[model samples]
Each structure stands twice: as C-alpha cells, then as structure tokens.
Target: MERFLRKYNISGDYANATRTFLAISPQWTCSHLKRNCLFNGMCAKQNFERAMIAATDAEEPAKAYRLVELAKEAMYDRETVWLQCFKSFSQPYEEDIEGKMKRCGAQLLEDYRKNGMMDEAVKQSALVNSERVRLDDSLSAMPYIYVPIKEGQIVNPTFISRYRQIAYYFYSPNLADDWIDPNLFGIRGQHNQIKREIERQVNTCPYTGYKGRVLQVMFLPIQLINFLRMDDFAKHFNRYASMAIQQYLRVGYAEEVRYVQQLFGKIPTGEFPLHHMMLMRRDFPTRDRSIVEARVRRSGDENWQSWLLPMIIVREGLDHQDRWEWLIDYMDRKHTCQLCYLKHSKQIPTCGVIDVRASELTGCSPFKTVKIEEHVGNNSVFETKLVRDEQIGRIGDHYYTTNCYTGAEALITTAIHIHRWIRGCGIWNDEGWREGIFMLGRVLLRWELTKAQRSALLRLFCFVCYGYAPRADGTIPDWNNLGSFLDTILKGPELSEDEDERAYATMFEMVRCIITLCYAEKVHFAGFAAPACESGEVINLAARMSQMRMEY
Candidate 1:
C-alpha cells in the first residue's frame, strides 16, 4: 500500500489513501471479467466491439468493423496506456478503458460480420458452450480433493465421498447483496416496481434456488439494518460518557444463528428451504448423504435449529449472569472439537486451555485447543514434517482462518460484539488491538465502516480485551447512540470502588471512567477509536509489506 501510494505520489495516511485505490482497482474489474463474462476468449472482443459502435458515428457495419480492428490493435499495443488513463482520470474516463480494450479485441468479429462472412463471424463470437463447460467443471470439483482419477476407471465411491465431505466441509453460505433481488425488502407500494427491476437484472430467483444469489443479498441487508440499529444504541451509550458501561455489548455467532432462526420461522423448515437459503450444513442428517455433497445440502437452506445465535441470545436473556459461563459451558457440553476451536481461536493456546486472563474473552476470538502430541503419533520425523506442513498450510491456505488478522477482519465486519467494543474505543495507533477493533467495526458496519475507523479500531479494542473489566451485562448496546446511555449513567452516583475487591473494583472504575470520558466528547473518544479501526487494514498491509513477517 505504501509502495502504491509512493509510486502514485499519493499523500496522507496510506491506509486512508488505499481505499480510493481499491475503489478504482483493476484487480476487481479483471476478476469480474474473468468470473462474470461467460464467453470464452470473447469478452475482450465483445466489449471492444460494443464500445466501437458507441464511440463514433459509424452506423455502417463496415465502419464499426473498421473501428473495432483499430481499437483492438491499439489496446494490444497500449495496454499500460489504458490502465494509466483509467487511474489518472475519473469514472467516465475509466469507463473508456474497458471499452477501448474490448473494441480492440473485437475487431475480427466485426470485420467478419461486415464482409458477409457469416460463418466466420459466428465462429469468431465467444465460445459460450465451451466456457460454460469449463466453469461447470471448475465449480463441480471439490476444493479439498487432491487426487487424480484415471479416465475410464470407475473410482471407488468412498474416494468420491471423501472429496464431497472435504469440499462441503469448507463450503459456506454466499451472503453478498448482489445475490438477492431487492424487491423482498421493498415496501408494499414499491414491491412491484422493485420486483420488475430485479427480474430484468437477475435471471434466477435467488431466494428459491439452493445456490440462488437472492439469499446472499437478503442476509447482508437485513443484518446491516439490524447492525445499524445496534451500533446506534452502542454509540449513544459511549458518546454520553467516558466510563465504560456495566458491560460491553458486541454481536456474536449467536446473533447469526438468531437471524437464521427468524428467517426459518417465516419460511418452512425443510431440505428444499434450507438448500435455498444456503444454510444447510453438509453434515446435516439425510439419507442421500452418500451421493450428495454436504455443502450443497444447505446451499440456501437454513436449518434454524442448528443456528447458534438465537440459542445463545435466549440463554443470555434468560440467564444474564451465565453469558461467558454459558459460552464455556456450551463448548464443554458439545465436546467442542479442538481442531475446530484452534481454527477459530484468536490467541495462542497452552496446556489444553485458552487462558482467558491472557487475552480478552472475545466471541470473535473463540479459542481452539488442539492435542498436538496426539496428532504427532509415534514417528518423530513424520511428526516434524507434519508440523511443518500444517504450519505451512495454516499460513498459506488457512492464514485467514481466524484471529491473527484476516479472520479478525471477517469477525469485525460480521460480529456485532466486536463492533461495539471498537466504537467505544477511539484510539488510532497502529497496533495489534487496532486490527482487532477495526475488523469488528468493519464486519459490523457492513463495509460502511470508514477506512479510517476500520484501520484504527482494531488496536484499541484489543487493548481493552488485554485490560480487565468487571463482569457486567453481555448486552451490546448501539454505539451510534451511546451518548444517551452515558447521560443516564452520569446522573447516577459513582460506585464505591474502595469497598470492593481490588481487581474487581479497579475494573469497574476503569470502565466507568472510559464511559464517562466518551460522554464528555459526545463520541467514543475519536483518539482511541480511529487507530483501532486502522489496525485491521494495517494487518493486511503489514502482511503484504515483508515476506518474513507474513505466513500467507
């Protein structure tokens, strides 16, 4: 990021500046072209031809064809020119870059069309069938499968079964906004309007299809609205005072589980519905498990019962004191898989227990304890190689698994609990906590969290986690409207800290002071919050900075 900024003569915080670069980044465009353009080797040509037609007064097919050829040659010769022009100028100019490149590529097709070479023209058109087949094969292959089967050989059913298991094991619900038609969320008056627009743009019904794009869209918007409401509440409480609230409220896995539950209540619970919602776990009990890959089982389906958020919320609401206790208990009751726990654990594990004292008890940073000795088995050399291999995979494949940085970003963007903690802290230092807080805020805010906040909040939130706080409510209030909460606390008399146990009293007082300070500023003190938000981006940036410091 720094290098990009320096190369471009960009100034200000590199973190702040990079978002602009990302906004115009060709990486996404190039990827979109590769992913979305269905025609094989023809998108370049198609885009160019379309642009050539639009660019000039060349109404004749011959004229358009002529322009197309010129455009293609120009693009091939000046690829860098297109990129530079795209970056230096604004949108319309940038738009030209794509058109120019495409027109240049499409010249042959246009010429064929103009010269009565209908057969050749058709041939020149993108190979949609071949492209579709290629894509289908890519999609069909399991991500975890590594074996190659000989042609004409009937592979063992078990081998295929394992491939399906591994593939589905990593499959997750696609929850992007583009997947859903916006009509579902529209008001009654706009329903038809939204529906019409959606149908025109999207070919498939995302909500009904197991792998439908609609479900992904729905997940983000509804969750975002809820998040806004939550953030607003947390902000109010913090803004009104500096003293920490009795307890910090942040969203957690349980909330996602609840979101699914609520959706399930409205929709019928069945394999079809679960598949449509993309919530069905691959491991879900079903007779056809042998043939069907588990991932596809819940492609769009939500087995709300399997959801964790609603259960946790209900438990928390019912027995408020048992929040963390319930978390630990739940893990214990489930005989939580140590490997899975390690996959999500944010901190280093020791002695089979994740010492809560060593790190803040964060829902986002749930610990995973692994029995390394058991995994090692009897062979010392094999064990050594295995450890090395596993470490390599962790850095290469699972670096984004959890905690360290990438995982933190995902947690921050998605986890409500982490977001609330970040809003409370306003520091902007480039530190570990900064990354943690920023990830929480970004995930919670649904990409609306400012790049600045996203970068800074990570560090500050981590600091609070490392520091102590007395047990209080597990409820995460909306940070957006924290001032109101602060005011209410101000009217109350200060707690008698001297009479309490030293550790407990100190924590309580510290929280109180932080909340009180927040109230005085009318915002989570900007100083603590900003740096923490930046830290998340810093992790991403740092990972790219040095080869040695980075694992993946």
Candidate 2:
C-alpha cells in the first residue's frame, strides 16, 4: 500500500487518507486500482469513488442467478472480454464447444504477430499474459477518464433495489401511460415507435432483464435533461425503483418523426433512412488520439510513464441492435489484426446555406441538397461523391478567438453578429430551428415591425439556451461586435410592447411557436429531438436549464 501510494505520488495528507480508505476495500488489488483510474476532477474524490467502485466490483458473488450482471458489469467496464476467452481456454469446462472460441483468440494473436500488426499483436499478448509483460511505446497504459461527459450513477440503488430492479429504462404502464397520454401532445406516429422500442428490449436475460411497454423512455445520457431542465428530477426521482428500468437504449432517433414515419409507413425509394444516417462513422475524430494521456507508475515501480488509451463511448443513440455487435466485432478484429486503422473519416461535406426561397417561401434549396453519410458495418466499402461546394446545406463557420484568462489561457469565440446572427437568419445553416427562431420574430407582428425582427427572437432563444444576459444600455459598446443588420441584441430581454400586443410575446409565445414550427410542422423539431410538453410551464421549465444551478 505504501509503495502503491508512492508510485502515484500520493504523499502528504491524501496518502494517509487513501491508505485508510484502501484498508476498507481489501479486494481491489494494486493492479486493479492502477488500471481503472478513470475518474475525473479532484484527486481526493477520485480516490474515494474509484475505491468504492473497485470494492463493489470485487465483491464475492452469491449462488447462481443472484445478481449475475455484477460480473458482466465489471467485464464491460474493464473491456476484459478478451481475457475471458483465455480463462475459458485454460479452465476447459466444456472442451470441444469452447475449444474453437479459445483457439481462435490464441491463433488471432499469433497471426497478428506473423502479419504486419506487430503493435496490436504485442498488446494482445500483454493483456493475455497478464501484468508480467511490461508496457511501453506503442502500447498505452491509460485509465477510464471520460472528458466532459461527467458520468456517475443517478442515484445509488440499495442492493435489494438494484437486485429487484425493473428492466432498464422501460417505463411502466402506470408511469408511461400517464406521461405519454396520447391525449397529451401526442403526435400520430410517435406512439407506434415507442411500442417498437419497448418491444425490442422485451427479451429475458440472466443479467438485468429488459422488458415492458415504453411509451416513455429514459437513458442515463438524456436523463441529463431532467437533471438540468427538470430541476434535478433524477435527484428527486428513483427511476429504477419505479420498476421502469429496461436493458437497452431508446436512442433519440427512436422518437424522431421522420425515422418513425419511414419505419411504420410505406417504403420511400431513393431516400436514405433518416435515422440510420445519424449514427454514421464520421463522428469520431483522430486529433483526440492522444487525448486520454496521463502520467503514472506501476504499483511498486518508481519510473513514471505517459499513457494513451482509446475511448469507447456509448453516447447519443443507436438501433438495429445487431449492427452494434457486428461493428464492435469488426473493430475488434481490425484492432487486434492491425489490418486497418480506426481512421477518422471526414464529415458529411456541405455547401454553405443560402436562401433561394421565392416570395412563396417554400425554402427548397437546403431541402433539395442532401449530406451523404458512411455507416459502420463489417467489411463494407464506404463511398460517397461530394456535393459541389455551392450546394445548399449547412456546415460550421470559421471560429475567431479573443482575449485571455488571468494568466496563460485565452477565452475565444467569434463574438460577432454577422457570423452568429446569419446562422439564425438562414444565411449559414439549414437547421430548421434556426429559421424558426427568426421566423418567430418575423411572425410575431408581421405588419408591426420590420428590419430583422426575425433576429430578435433568435437572440432571445440563444439567451434562453445559453443563459447569457445582455447589458442594460441606452448606448452600447460592441465588445461582442454584434452587427446592426439584425438590429442590436435585445435591451435586457424586454421586447417592445404595444396595445395591439402584436410586438409583444412571452416565453409562452416563443415556446408555442416552437411546438408548432419545430414539433407539429417538423421544422424546428420532429419527434424525439424536440421535448414533448404537457404545458407551457414545462417548456419554460426546460428553458430554465440554462441557468445551470444544482443540475447534478
């Protein structure tokens, strides 16, 4: 223990405290703590949380069928499935059946070594042979730290509650039936997709089970909205105890209106699946190849080494569940065989958006142009021709930077209206919400005000989502260098009021337009991307997330 603390340089008061804490969790070996050091933030809290996590995973299992998933959780978190094949190889309970699986893993490493994949082969050998094989150079010794994705359990379920947990995320008929009452803001096809999603998770498992009706769904990721927007709704609510848990994700695309319509209705030819395209392979980038670096020493070793590790994130959403299995397997083979690199493919190319809509205001240019995508699959050739740069679409713009912090770091953004406001005004992007915000401003009082009233509501919506306040000024300094084309940013959120109430509106009005344009009409939001609301109060409550209080 003393050597372990010294290797990590955990001296002084923390060293003593950690020693005491480690004493409580004797099950986590030094190597276990050393490998899974994935926590972020204060080193003090990190020590405790990791110690707790290690101790929990290290707990002895009960008889068969009792909380069997605890073991799976450890393997999943540790990415130790490869090691399991080796263990089965050595133990040999069912020789013939398991022999093929075990033999393949061993042969895979040997083939990797014989082929050009020496580094990956070395990594496989090191992991398979345990800690005896020293790590260096091409092999990274990094831990589980996730950047900015602040992960933690929503609430600690008591052991019994966890054991008796409902299927994960599947809302009960009692809870879901009330929340998604087809009577309350229910769209035509949305109800159908929820049934299908719930249907997919309806299988039995030796691990935590997945079953039930899911008119409403929650994943740990999206529940963040409830944390921030619903005033720490998860803090107050115990979702699992409600027996609403199910074992899969209802990725936001499941609720997507276009995806839902396409799935349930007739097959539309020539059009790509709106939902599948979102999960395309272009999202991961290579600049972050060295992102998970850290300085650390082995348990009793004095020499400190820098480590880099791969991030395996399950974010946002997915469906066609089998695709994930195939993709992971394909990645695993390429990873071990060194046959291919996890190349950071380029993004869906785009042409800067332009408003070619006539006085009729159909807005065909952006709609007609399509951004091509590359999906993750097994040995599939990826091909797509670029749309000539002038096509009607939205890609991001050049970001500008400015002044610094108290010392070395500079805080930078393109703090100007010309670049920013154009985004809301349909000059830069094709996102429907952008235009709807501007349209909300324009439609507020069609005859009452002119000259970029459209821009006003965007700043308001931006202010709502971003929670940045504008200064109260009769005369303004252009620190942000906001252009005059969109009229100045609002003077303290007070839009000009009149007896006609045409120029006047509230959070309620903007929100009402949000549901209509974005939700009902499918401009601003379609299906699950837009939050379903029972009342204006709920919408405004969601808007309050920008304040960013005790959202944890």
Candidate 3:
C-alpha cells in the first residue's frame, strides 16, 4: 500500500485511511474497495491514483491535474448506473474500457497543455514587443500588469507575470482577441483557434448572456408566495399535509419570499440588474403576415398575455374538479382552436341552420368541436375570477389580461410559459409543476443559505436539477425524495434577520456556480476545439468559491 501510494504520488494519509477501511471490512474485495472509494465518496487516494494514470497516459501532469479536479465532482457523486455498469468487471479491467477512458483523459490533458503553452508564448511575445516599441501612449493604453516574473533573475520572468499579462490581453478593451498579434506568438496553424477561444472566454460573463432570464427567474420565489396566497386551504392543502401544517409552510414561503425580495433590491446593478428585456417572442416576418392573421382569427389574438391569465390565477372556493376542468378547457381551446380553422376551411355545406347557406357561399362551414368533458367528468358549474388584482389588467368591463413582457408580471408569465413549454416538449409530466416548485426552492436558497447549509442545499439542487437522486440500485432517482427534501429544508430552524439578509447574496452566487458548472460541462462534452480562455478561469474561480461554500 505504501509503495502503491508513493508510485501514484498519492498522500500517505489517504492510503492509510483506505487500508484501515479495507482491514475492517475484509469481505469487501479490492475491486469493491476501488468502486466504493472512487464512486460513492470523495476519497483522495482513489482520485490521486486516477489522476496519476491520466497524467502518465497523457504525458502532461499539470493539465491532467486540472482535468482530474474538474471531473472529480461528477465522478464522486455519479449516478448508480455508473457503478452498476462497472460492477461486473473482473480483477483486470477490459482492454476496451481501459483504452477508452485513457484516450479521453489523454486528449483533454494534451489539449489543455497545448492551450497553456500558446498562452505563455503569447504573453512572452507581448512583453518583448511592448519593450522594443517603447511607445508611451500605446504602453499606457495597454492593460498589461507589470509584475516581476522571477525572484533573483530579472531577465527571466515568472509564470505569475506571464499569467497576469495573458489575463490582461484577454480582458483588454477592444483588444480581447485582436490585441494579441498572432505573429508575436509564432503564428502556428492552431493559433487562430486559440485566439478565438481566448476571446470567447473574455467575453463570457457570469450570466453567460442569460442575465435577463436569470434575474427574471429570481422573482419566481416571490411569485410562488403569491401563488400560495391565492390557493384555498381545501384545494391546495389537500395535496400536502393537514391544513394547520400547510398553513405554517405557506407562511414560511411568504417570509422567505419577502426576505429574498429585499435582498434582490439590494443586489448591485453590475451584479444583477433589476430591470432588463423581459421574454422576447420569436420574430414574425411580413411574408408570414397571413399566417399570423389566420392564427389571430382562429385563436382570438396574438398576444400571449391574454391566454396566460387564466392559467396562472387560482379562484378561491373552486373545487379541484372545477379548477382542473377550467384549466383543461382553456388549454384545449388554446391548442385546438388553431386546428378548428384548418378543419372548417376544408369542409363545404352543412345541414345545420339558416346560417349554413351563407357559410357555404363563403366556403366556410361549421366543424365538429372537441370537448374535454367527455374525457374528463363534468363537475358542478363554477364561475371563476382572478384571485389577485395585481396580476390582471382590466381593459373596460371585459378582457382581463396579463402582460408577458413587463416586470413581475413578465417574470410570472415566463415561469408559467417555461412550465408549459417543458411539458409541451414531453420532457416530464404534471406540466413540470414539480420542476417549478424545485426552481423556486433553488431561487430561495440562492441567498438564504449559510456555509453550513451549502452542502445540503447543493445536494438538494443537484437532485432537482438533474431530476435524479443518488440511489443504491442502478435506477432513476425517486421523485418523492425531492418534495420531502424541500419540505425538510423549508421547515428547518429560523435565522436572525441580519443573518437571513447576509445569506441572501449567496443564493445568486449559487445560481452562478450552477451556470458555470453547466457551461464547463457543455464546453468539455461538446468536444469543441476551443482553447481554455481567461473567462473560463474566472468562471472556474467563482465556481471554486461556491464549492468552498459547500465544503464541511
């Protein structure tokens, strides 16, 4: 074990810990030990061994270390199928599996190493050219940070100086890519690709250009509080616990919403702007004018605001059956009404009434209308009204409306729209109601959690975001756990007002971390030949801070 640890450059403490665990659980073979260490938990020895293998195979230790660190989280807390898939392997790994993992590791390592070399070369060239030119105005304008590269040797610069210069070039105004001359860096065939990659990194911000949507979604927790307020005890509470406990939870939601709202207002403009472009609809061309007109004639109007009002508002005292019927009817009409025009336009004369003669002459005839009443049982007739005045716009005595392009209203509209969109995509059922609730929970925790609370919060977020939970068997995560986890966290111990406010900022930080992780995954998995840019480093640093928050 000592020799193995030394050979792999693994820490002695980690090796000892693994050895101790193996001694105690003699029934568990070395294979099981490797599986359990590598998959179920964060074991440094196993990671170090894997890293060593990757580094050795790739012949780039520095790049392999970075790649290994980046991949650690996914591997440590991977889904059960990952383990089950590897469980049947014998003492010696199969050649195919070994080669596949090795090649992937090697490719990432080599690519990253080559990128670092290019950046270093660019930094050196920039320094040399700047010194040779000695143009005061250009030097002043340059975003270069002058730092000693070496301690004793003034002639030889350190990696830190080069790193700083590289970062500066990537971030310099109007010079992100164009500032660094390819000729200076010896202009290799791959240098253009490297330059493009660096520019992309410098341009990318924490929001990843989704700042509008991110800030808009920040208001969702507050909207949920309003939603809970509209829900009557008999209807909404029936799905959860007893009325008393449900009432307690409802109050908690309101409190959390208010706390988050206050925090949101305090968020600095550069960090997260309160107002931006709300959800923009897809563009319509003049050529598609007839299509739009036809759609309006069949579906009433082009404004999504008018259609969204009924879907969000919950009328008080309405029974579950009535509420569902109303929702189904509205949804059915919204979708089926378009089809009505198509069907009716093709049909000719009908033997219905006197109006049929005029309809036939106009080449328009009545078509059979589809009803949900047959599929869904008809309940007692109930008149529904908007639960909140703030949500609706009253244009004269009729036409209650909700605009999907303003402030809170727009945010609410987008939330509901995405919910319907996700369902329409057939990704999940129940119209992604659970996903909505989970999204609210994530937004709430964005600023409300402490360092102590981060791990638990991240675990919950991971489960919700992935739509999967850590399981012993190689099956999908149990959905019920998400609801139960949320319930547990919301009902946990209360904090002081100051503590609550202080914790609020981290909520957005958490979101930023999630976005960074997602971006990294996309960049890596997509196999895009983009070099590791300075913006990626910044994102990684931010993500590191977030990970620190989750550390015990």
Candidate 4:
C-alpha cells in the first residue's frame, strides 16, 4: 500500500508505521524490521508494552503482531546488544522465564484510535495463576532449592575471640530481629507480619501457607545471602528468601529427628520435614562451584574450620597455651552425632543428663557437628587418614580412633604439655626423668609392640623423639644394640643385676611424662595400661602416636 500510494501521480505523502505488528511477509523487511514506531520513531520497553497492550485489547491481529515485531526488531537492531549477528533462531525472540519476571504488567484502557496508551498506563494486570501467585507482584512465589554439595571439594582478625553474631529470619506475625539463639535464652520467640498478607505480596509462600502466627527461622548471615543465591534466585528476593529459609533450616538424618523435637511448639513436627522435602524435586546443582554445591559445601566447611579456630587462634607453634582445637573438634563431633542418633531413634543414651544452656555454648552451630571430615571434601590422604579412624569413629569414644594429624600433631602437642610439668625437665634430668624411661617400657607391652619393634623404639626414644638433634643425649641408651634384647622378660625392665636398671628407668620416666602431658590435654589412650601405676588417661597418647595395630 505504501509503494502503491507513492507510485501514483495523485502524489500524497505516504509513510508506513515504520514498525508493524504484522509478522506476515510483504510488510516485512529485514529480520530486523518493525511497525510499532513512536515519537514518530522512538521506542522504549514501557512504550512497547503499552503499545502491545493497546493492540491486544483492540484484538486486531495485525496491530498486536506489529508491536511485538517492532520490539523484537529493536532488540536485535541495537548495536550495543548485537543480538542479530549472533542470533541463534530465525523466529521471534521469546523472553525466558527470567526475562518475563523482569516485566511489570500494564493494561490498555484507551482505544487503538483513542490512544492514551502511548502516553500512560490504564491499570496493573492482576493476573493470577492457578496457584494463587500474583503475577506482576512485589516478588515471585517460587523458591530455588539450595543444592547439597558434598562432592570431592576442597578468618579474620580483630577481637579474635568474637565474630559476627548468629542471625535468624523468621516469618513474623509481629516484629523481631536476630542475634543469637533462642536455645541460649536470647529471644525465645520473635514476632513479625507473617500471617497477614501485604498488598501485592505473593500469596503462595510456604511460610504464608501456614496461617495464624506461624513461627519459623532461617539462620541467615548477611554474607550468606550471597552464598544462598542460585541460578533461579533472581528477582524474587523475598520470595526466594522465604522458600530457601525453610529448605536451609533442615539438615537431616539424626538432626532431622532432633528438629522434630527441637522446634516442637514453634514449628509443628510434621510440617517441618514436609517442607524440608518440599523442594527436593528441584535439581540439585552439581557444578564444581555451583551455588547449590557452594551452599552445601559452604555450610559444612565453615563449621569445621570454625571448630578448629581455637587451636590456632593463639597458637604458640609448640602446641602451648590452649590450642586443643582438633581435640575439641573430635569431642564435639562425637557429642553432636550422638545427639542426632539418640533424638531420632528415641534412645536414651545419656539417661536424661540435664544441663543449663550456658552462654559459652551459644555460638556453636547446632548443624555445626555434621561436617565433611573424611568425605569428598579435600580428600588429601593425610587429612582423612585417622589414627585407627578406619576401625571405630565418633561412636567409639572409649576407644578413640585418631585422625591423620592425630598421631603426628598430638604427640608434639603433648610434648609441650609435658615440658611445662616437671621442673628442670631436661632430656636427662637425673631425678624425675628416670620414671619417663620406665613408662616407655609399659607402652611397649600395653601397645603390644613385638620384640623387634619394641627393641628399635626403645633404643631410639631418647635420641629422635624431641631432642631436635639425634645426638643430644638425654635418655641415651647409647649402649650396645644387644642390650635392647636379652632375657628382658616381663612388662617391667629386665634386671641384669648389673645396675642396668638405672639406665632402663631413665627411658621409662621420659615416656611417662610424654603420656602424662597428652592425658592432661585429653588424650585418653584406647587400651589398658600394663602397670596399674601408669596414668591411665595418658596411655594412648604415645601409643596412638605410633599407630600400633595391637590385636590385644
């Protein structure tokens, strides 16, 4: 029609809409042509939307088509975007779910001819999905699931003792803010505007699903908000926060059982787990550093690193001044695991052991215990290998299975403990040192070391153990190699009737001090000490350090 009118001598100024709503051919120019031009030729997203709505209300197929086409044309035409050269498809560009989320709905109240739409909106689209989620509302109703990443994965200063406080967000029926735990007598119950709906708030929230002052919590650290973000986490900050809160709160197995009892009055037992499994259908991310993987990996790694902070917080390099971080870590892990199974199975292992919930115990992560110590995270051989860890774990507390650094680090750590004990405790202190060597003999027996192995260790104990130098003579059994053998019959030193007892006695006392120090640091040996006189608590300190595989 444009060419037909212009071609005639009845010449009239003829100009097309410049952009068209029609997807049909003759009007079509490049894949980059359009008809919804305005300002005579100006365009913006809001303008495009307003025009699209006007065309839709007019229900004139060509007008709406032209507006959509114009928008698509503008999308590709902008050199800044450069979508045309790289365009993958020939069809009209379809906005993704995320793109759709970015749009706010508007209606066309003016006629296509009586156009006020080009200048302003009529009203907001109150489109409601079947789920009752309000489209074009404040935020989305759907929530992204946090991926539980546990695969082959792999601080601060100042005030040092204190860090950020634990922060929790609960869908409120009144008002509240977060700091510490309710368990430790902080804010037991906080209120917020959870039950009542706000204008344009997505009505489809799981938290909103629970009507009437429904109380729940999410241990959200401000730093964690970034950590919690996933691919689908865009646009619905409040919406995602609500859904992820319920999902993040749960870490199942034994803890799941504990939770069933824990927030008993706060959250109904049945509803808690129901929501826990609520987003399981959401694909758990598997990317090496995907947000889901990052979150799961993050939740645990942060905990474990946190547990050992005290050990290194003020470390003296020689394990002095209260750095039993690993020891503390082990004890806590055992305690937490026990709590888990006990609560879930309803097994009263503690027999109702009660205690006051103190402030010192407050900062600990209730989920802090379930970390990936030997799992796919940091599969370093030395890190995962424990002192008899393969045998018994957190459960076998009486018979402690040591971790990798257990044997190596604990012994050195224990040595420092021994140093601070006996006065003038040199390698060969004439008086108290004799007991150290004899303690050595007791270990050979209790540890069930064979004659050959015991013989080698007995000779080497003084020289290499802590001398820093091989020849720094302390318990120098620098005697003939044959002396380690002999009719050295029982668990105690063999009496040669030649005053050799004096020599043997020195070695035992030295070893004894080693064990005593370890015991002081909570190094309970796994086996029975051979001599009743030996300190029972310190026995495994040296024995486990040697990593003996004793059948006894």
Top candidate by TM-score: 4
lDDT of 4 by residue, 1-552 (tens): 232222331111111122221222222234214543552344433354344444444545444445444545544322322122112212323334222322210111111113222121112122222222211111111122211112221001111110011113312111111122222222222222321222113223332333323244332223333423433332233443454344345644344534332221123345445343222222222322221122222222222222111211111211332322222333334332222333343333221111111112322222111122222212111122212212111211111122222222222222222222222332344332333332333333223222233333333343223221112222212211122212221123332332222223343333334333323333345776555556755776767856765645
Quote the positional error of residue 256 for candidate 3 in Å: 30
Model 1 residue 282 lDDT score: 21
Q: What is the C-alpha lDDT profile of model 3 across 6-31, one tens digit per residue? A: 44454422332333222222222234
Model 2 compared with the native: what TM-score? 0.18
Looking at candidate 1, the ten consecutive residues that score lowest on lDDT are 159-168
Worst ten in a row by lDDT for model 3:
212-221
Candidate 4, which segments miss by more than 4 Å at Cα? 1-442, 447-451, 463-503, 511-552
Q: What is the lDDT of residue 445 in candidate 1?
A: 22
Superposed by TM-score, candidate 4 places the C-alpha of residue 498 at a distance from the truth, in angstroms, of 8.5
Question: Could you estimate the TM-score for every candidate?
Answer: 0.17, 0.18, 0.18, 0.18
Q: Kindly provide the TM-score of model 3 when superposed on the true structure, using C-alpha atoms.
A: 0.18
lDDT of 2 at 141: 21
